Amino acid sequence: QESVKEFLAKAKEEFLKKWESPSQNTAQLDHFDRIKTLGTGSFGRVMLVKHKETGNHYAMKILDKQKVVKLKQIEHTLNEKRILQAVNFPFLVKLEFSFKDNSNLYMVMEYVPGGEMFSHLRRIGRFSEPHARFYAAQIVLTFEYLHSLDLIYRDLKPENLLIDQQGYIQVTDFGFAKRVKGRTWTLCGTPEYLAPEIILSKGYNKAVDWWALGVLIYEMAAGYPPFFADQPIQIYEKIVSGKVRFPSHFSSDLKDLLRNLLQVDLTKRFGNLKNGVNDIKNHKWFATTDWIAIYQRKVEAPFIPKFKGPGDTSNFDDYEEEEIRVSINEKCGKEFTEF
Ligand SMILES: c1cc(-c2nnc([C@H]3CCNC3)o2)ccn1
Ligand SMILES: c1cc(-c2nnc([C@H]3CCNC3)o2)ccn1
């Protein structure tokens, strides 16, 4: 494990150098052509763009500054960009450029054309245990990396996991990620994936990412999440009870892993014990996993998405196409000085 200790020590050195001196203002809007909207939200959207001089394709996340302020997301938005420009790991989407103008904030990422894990899971129904285990091992390594840097991710769900041209995962959307030594308190995340200590308004820590990994593995292997209900208040009641029913087709090793990740007592939850991530890596359900081979991307993927080239949008869906307007006057300049 010395080689793992020294890898993580080097990873932290390189993150901290970029964290302390973040890059800013590395492109501008009229360097790109707009192609298609890939997703939309409360204060921002993600567009496929093409760089006019190089011809490269990118995914550009665009946030309306005035709406960020109104939804009280200033701190979270600054978190997202400062973390994304500082990290480097095989299963994290790469931030290529960032900039701002009178109206908007922009984060320009590599474009991953295979689509969201959500689409593929819902089309096929459920993943076999080896298929789920291939994806789960990538998230285990990514959380080991993020947590060693004192980062909590806080938005694990199938919609945020993109599948690349080799069938591996690229994690996207750091809107709720935060550097945290100790506890933190914000209510955020999707209802089906929230740990009990978030719902109960406690000070919580990185163990909430390991709870969310339990939810994700269950959903990949069953086809639906463990605390499913029609409205959030009913979901929250099932989460805090912790009663979980497992389908009969689950293996005994899978049920045992999930009982330890979906542990309502955070001081007993796998990932948060004295042996840290190794209680997960050494569990019987991962016995066939070569952790080094996954990191080096040398395992053949269970599934390669169908797409025609780096500009193909066929694995994403259709949204109304709205203008990208930039006001003649600067909005919210002070609030976003550091961006
Ligand atoms: C303190 C507060 C926050 C924060 N961010 N959004 C919120 C929500 C409260 C109102 N709706 C959004 O609170 C972050 C860090 N410290
Ligand atoms: C393609 C897409 C993206 C991307 N970034 N954030 C998102 C969110 C949009 C909806 N759920 C995820 O998608 C990055 C690279 N290629």
Side-chain angles (χ1 to χ4, degrees), residues 2-3 6-17 19-41 43-52 54-69 71 73-93 95-109 111-123 125-164 167-180 182-205 207-232 235-236 239-242 244 246-273 275-283 285-291 293-297 299 301-305 307 309-324 326-327 329-330 332-333 335-339:
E2 269 74 25
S3 47
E6 301 298 327
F7 173 92
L8 295 176
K10 178 172 297 275
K12 191 163 192 153
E13 289 157 8
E14 304 192 350
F15 165 82
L16 283 176
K17 186 172 178 288
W19 182 251
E20 309 277 23
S21 305
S23 57
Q24 298 166 283
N25 193 37
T26 55
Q28 69 191 32
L29 184 57
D30 67 13
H31 292 170
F32 307 88
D33 285 314
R34 171 242 188 95
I35 307 291
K36 184 178 220 287
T37 299
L38 310 170
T40 314
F43 47 100
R45 57 194 146 164
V46 181
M47 329 277 285
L48 175 63
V49 301
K50 181 169 169 184
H51 190 283
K52 286 152 97 179
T54 67
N56 288 325
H57 289 84
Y58 298 99
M60 176 190 278
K61 182 178 181 155
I62 309 175
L63 304 170
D64 184 311
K65 284 191 283 183
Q66 285 179 329
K67 297 183 189 156
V68 168
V69 176
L71 291 160
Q73 298 295 304
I74 302 166
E75 182 181 345
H76 285 168
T77 294
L78 298 175
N79 285 339
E80 180 169 22
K81 178 249 176 186
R82 192 177 175 179
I83 297 171
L84 274 178
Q85 62 90 37
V87 286
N88 170 29
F89 200 68
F91 315 123
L92 294 176
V93 72
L95 183 67
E96 299 293 350
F97 312 96
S98 74
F99 60 93
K100 67 206 182 188
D101 62 26
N102 276 354
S103 291
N104 305 314
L105 313 167
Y106 310 78
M107 285 170 284
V108 183
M109 293 162 276
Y111 173 55
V112 186
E116 301 175 357
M117 180 193 295
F118 187 76
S119 302
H120 297 294
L121 177 58
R122 290 283 185 92
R123 185 181 313 258
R126 71 191 186 210
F127 296 151
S128 73
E129 294 190 28
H131 188 168
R133 175 164 43 240
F134 173 80
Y135 295 151
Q138 291 169 65
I139 302 297
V140 171
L141 291 169
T142 301
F143 285 174
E144 175 176 35
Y145 171 83
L146 289 180
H147 291 177
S148 71
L149 305 183
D150 306 304
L151 304 167
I152 311 172
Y153 173 57
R154 297 199 299 189
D155 210 13
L156 192 70
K157 57 183 176 174
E159 298 95 312
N160 284 347
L161 300 182
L162 310 179
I163 305 194
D164 68 19
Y168 282 72
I169 288 179
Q170 299 268 308
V171 183
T172 197
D173 200 343
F174 276 59
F176 298 144
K178 181 186 189 186
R179 193 157 196 251
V180 170
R183 299 160 291 167
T184 197
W185 284 262
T186 313
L187 170 59
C188 59
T190 202
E192 294 279 3
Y193 279 75
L194 298 179
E197 58 265 34
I198 305 183
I199 292 153
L200 298 169
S201 305
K202 300 187 173 161
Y204 59 85
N205 61 22
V208 306
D209 281 339
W210 297 123
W211 173 281
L213 174 65
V215 185
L216 185 79
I217 295 174
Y218 184 112
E219 183 155 27
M220 291 190 292
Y224 52 86
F227 307 109
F228 182 78
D230 185 62
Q231 307 277 329
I235 296 166
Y236 297 158
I239 287 162
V240 177
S241 91
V244 56
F246 300 110
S248 60
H249 62 85
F250 277 21
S251 73
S252 294
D253 290 335
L254 178 58
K255 293 191 291 203
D256 187 79
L257 176 57
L258 294 174
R259 292 189 197 276
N260 283 290
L261 291 170
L262 299 174
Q263 167 54 253
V264 291
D265 182 342
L266 71 87
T267 74
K268 304 183 171 171
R269 190 182 298 149
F270 267 20
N272 200 40
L273 310 187
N275 290 131
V277 72
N278 293 321
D279 289 330
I280 296 170
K281 293 191 178 179
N282 289 332
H283 192 278
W285 193 69
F286 284 109
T288 64
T289 298
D290 184 339
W291 292 97
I294 294 285
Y295 170 82
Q296 297 183 345
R297 300 169 65 95
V299 176
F303 164 73
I304 310 293
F307 67 108
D312 193 355
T313 57
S314 71
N315 288 293
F316 299 90
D317 290 314
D318 298 336
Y319 304 85
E320 177 178 353
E321 293 295 347
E322 296 186 302
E323 292 277 16
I324 304 165
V326 179
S327 163
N329 308 303
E330 177 189 68
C332 316
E335 294 87 334
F336 298 98
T337 308
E338 81 171 62
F339 189 100

PDB file of all heavy atoms in Angstrom, residues 155-167, unseen atoms left out:
ATOM      1  N   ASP A 155     -23.426  14.616  -4.996  1.00  0.00           N
ATOM      2  CA  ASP A 155     -24.467  14.546  -6.034  1.00  0.00           C
ATOM      3  C   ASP A 155     -24.370  13.240  -6.836  1.00  0.00           C
ATOM      4  O   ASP A 155     -24.645  13.217  -8.042  1.00  0.00           O
ATOM      5  CB  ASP A 155     -24.404  15.764  -6.971  1.00  0.00           C
ATOM      6  CG  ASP A 155     -25.797  16.158  -7.551  1.00  0.00           C
ATOM      7  OD1 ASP A 155     -26.849  15.671  -7.072  1.00  0.00           O
ATOM      8  OD2 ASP A 155     -25.815  16.964  -8.495  1.00  0.00           O
ATOM      9  N   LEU A 156     -24.024  12.129  -6.177  1.00  0.00           N
ATOM     10  CA  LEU A 156     -23.994  10.851  -6.887  1.00  0.00           C
ATOM     11  C   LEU A 156     -25.416  10.418  -7.281  1.00  0.00           C
ATOM     12  O   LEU A 156     -26.304  10.313  -6.426  1.00  0.00           O
ATOM     13  CB  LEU A 156     -23.302   9.779  -6.040  1.00  0.00           C
ATOM     14  CG  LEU A 156     -22.982   8.508  -6.835  1.00  0.00           C
ATOM     15  CD1 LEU A 156     -21.873   8.659  -7.899  1.00  0.00           C
ATOM     16  CD2 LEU A 156     -22.646   7.351  -5.883  1.00  0.00           C
ATOM     17  N   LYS A 157     -25.627  10.201  -8.578  1.00  0.00           N
ATOM     18  CA  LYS A 157     -26.863   9.670  -9.151  1.00  0.00           C
ATOM     19  C   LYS A 157     -26.569   9.296 -10.604  1.00  0.00           C
ATOM     20  O   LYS A 157     -25.608   9.810 -11.179  1.00  0.00           O
ATOM     21  CB  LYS A 157     -28.001  10.702  -9.086  1.00  0.00           C
ATOM     22  CG  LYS A 157     -27.668  12.021  -9.793  1.00  0.00           C
ATOM     23  CD  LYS A 157     -28.806  13.035  -9.639  1.00  0.00           C
ATOM     24  CE  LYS A 157     -28.454  14.376 -10.237  1.00  0.00           C
ATOM     25  NZ  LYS A 157     -29.673  15.287 -10.171  1.00  0.00           N
ATOM     26  N   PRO A 158     -27.375   8.403 -11.210  1.00  0.00           N
ATOM     27  CA  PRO A 158     -27.058   7.941 -12.577  1.00  0.00           C
ATOM     28  C   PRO A 158     -27.003   9.032 -13.632  1.00  0.00           C
ATOM     29  O   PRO A 158     -26.269   8.887 -14.625  1.00  0.00           O
ATOM     30  CB  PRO A 158     -28.183   6.932 -12.890  1.00  0.00           C
ATOM     31  CG  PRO A 158     -28.702   6.486 -11.558  1.00  0.00           C
ATOM     32  CD  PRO A 158     -28.531   7.698 -10.631  1.00  0.00           C
ATOM     33  N   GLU A 159     -27.756  10.120 -13.458  1.00  0.00           N
ATOM     34  CA  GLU A 159     -27.774  11.195 -14.448  1.00  0.00           C
ATOM     35  C   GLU A 159     -26.441  11.933 -14.531  1.00  0.00           C
ATOM     36  O   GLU A 159     -26.182  12.610 -15.533  1.00  0.00           O
ATOM     37  CB  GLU A 159     -28.884  12.211 -14.117  1.00  0.00           C
ATOM     38  CG  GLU A 159     -30.316  11.633 -14.146  1.00  0.00           C
ATOM     39  CD  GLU A 159     -30.841  11.166 -12.768  1.00  0.00           C
ATOM     40  OE1 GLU A 159     -30.145  10.432 -11.994  1.00  0.00           O
ATOM     41  OE2 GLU A 159     -31.991  11.543 -12.470  1.00  0.00           O
ATOM     42  N   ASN A 160     -25.612  11.861 -13.488  1.00  0.00           N
ATOM     43  CA  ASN A 160     -24.335  12.573 -13.480  1.00  0.00           C
ATOM     44  C   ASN A 160     -23.148  11.711 -13.920  1.00  0.00           C
ATOM     45  O   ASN A 160     -22.008  12.189 -13.877  1.00  0.00           O
ATOM     46  CB  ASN A 160     -24.059  13.150 -12.069  1.00  0.00           C
ATOM     47  CG  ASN A 160     -24.897  14.385 -11.776  1.00  0.00           C
ATOM     48  OD1 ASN A 160     -25.506  14.960 -12.693  1.00  0.00           O
ATOM     49  ND2 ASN A 160     -24.910  14.826 -10.495  1.00  0.00           N
ATOM     50  N   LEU A 161     -23.371  10.453 -14.327  1.00  0.00           N
ATOM     51  CA  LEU A 161     -22.291   9.537 -14.677  1.00  0.00           C
ATOM     52  C   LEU A 161     -22.342   9.343 -16.194  1.00  0.00           C
ATOM     53  O   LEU A 161     -23.268   8.702 -16.703  1.00  0.00           O
ATOM     54  CB  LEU A 161     -22.475   8.201 -13.941  1.00  0.00           C
ATOM     55  CG  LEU A 161     -22.480   8.366 -12.396  1.00  0.00           C
ATOM     56  CD1 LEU A 161     -22.610   6.999 -11.687  1.00  0.00           C
ATOM     57  CD2 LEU A 161     -21.215   9.084 -11.895  1.00  0.00           C
ATOM     58  N   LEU A 162     -21.379   9.905 -16.921  1.00  0.00           N
ATOM     59  CA  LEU A 162     -21.389   9.765 -18.379  1.00  0.00           C
ATOM     60  C   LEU A 162     -20.541   8.581 -18.807  1.00  0.00           C
ATOM     61  O   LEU A 162     -19.569   8.230 -18.137  1.00  0.00           O
ATOM     62  CB  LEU A 162     -20.871  11.028 -19.049  1.00  0.00           C
ATOM     63  CG  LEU A 162     -21.486  12.362 -18.599  1.00  0.00           C
ATOM     64  CD1 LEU A 162     -20.825  13.473 -19.361  1.00  0.00           C
ATOM     65  CD2 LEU A 162     -22.996  12.438 -18.720  1.00  0.00           C
ATOM     66  N   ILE A 163     -20.922   7.939 -19.920  1.00  0.00           N
ATOM     67  CA  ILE A 163     -20.212   6.750 -20.419  1.00  0.00           C
ATOM     68  C   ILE A 163     -19.379   7.166 -21.634  1.00  0.00           C
ATOM     69  O   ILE A 163     -19.918   7.735 -22.592  1.00  0.00           O
ATOM     70  CB  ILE A 163     -21.196   5.619 -20.784  1.00  0.00           C
ATOM     71  CG1 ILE A 163     -22.108   5.286 -19.592  1.00  0.00           C
ATOM     72  CG2 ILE A 163     -20.431   4.345 -21.210  1.00  0.00           C
ATOM     73  CD1 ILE A 163     -22.872   3.989 -19.750  1.00  0.00           C
ATOM     74  N   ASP A 164     -18.075   6.883 -21.605  1.00  0.00           N
ATOM     75  CA  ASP A 164     -17.212   7.398 -22.665  1.00  0.00           C
ATOM     76  C   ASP A 164     -17.054   6.377 -23.805  1.00  0.00           C
ATOM     77  O   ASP A 164     -17.681   5.315 -23.823  1.00  0.00           O
ATOM     78  CB  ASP A 164     -15.874   7.882 -22.100  1.00  0.00           C
ATOM     79  CG  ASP A 164     -14.975   6.777 -21.555  1.00  0.00           C
ATOM     80  OD1 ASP A 164     -15.148   5.591 -21.878  1.00  0.00           O
ATOM     81  OD2 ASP A 164     -14.043   7.151 -20.806  1.00  0.00           O
ATOM     82  N   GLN A 165     -16.202   6.719 -24.780  1.00  0.00           N
ATOM     83  CA  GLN A 165     -16.056   5.875 -25.959  1.00  0.00           C
ATOM     84  C   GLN A 165     -15.418   4.524 -25.648  1.00  0.00           C
ATOM     85  O   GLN A 165     -15.493   3.621 -26.488  1.00  0.00           O
ATOM     86  CB  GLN A 165     -15.250   6.600 -27.034  1.00  0.00           C
ATOM     87  CG  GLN A 165     -13.797   6.777 -26.706  1.00  0.00           C
ATOM     88  N   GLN A 166     -14.789   4.349 -24.480  1.00  0.00           N
ATOM     89  CA  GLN A 166     -14.275   3.027 -24.088  1.00  0.00           C
ATOM     90  C   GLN A 166     -15.198   2.299 -23.107  1.00  0.00           C
ATOM     91  O   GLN A 166     -14.852   1.202 -22.636  1.00  0.00           O
ATOM     92  CB  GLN A 166     -12.880   3.166 -23.479  1.00  0.00           C
ATOM     93  CG  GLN A 166     -11.869   3.799 -24.437  1.00  0.00           C
ATOM     94  N   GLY A 167     -16.362   2.880 -22.808  1.00  0.00           N
ATOM     95  CA  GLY A 167     -17.323   2.344 -21.866  1.00  0.00           C
ATOM     96  C   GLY A 167     -17.032   2.630 -20.408  1.00  0.00           C
ATOM     97  O   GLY A 167     -17.688   2.039 -19.539  1.00  0.00           O
TER      98      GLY A 167
END
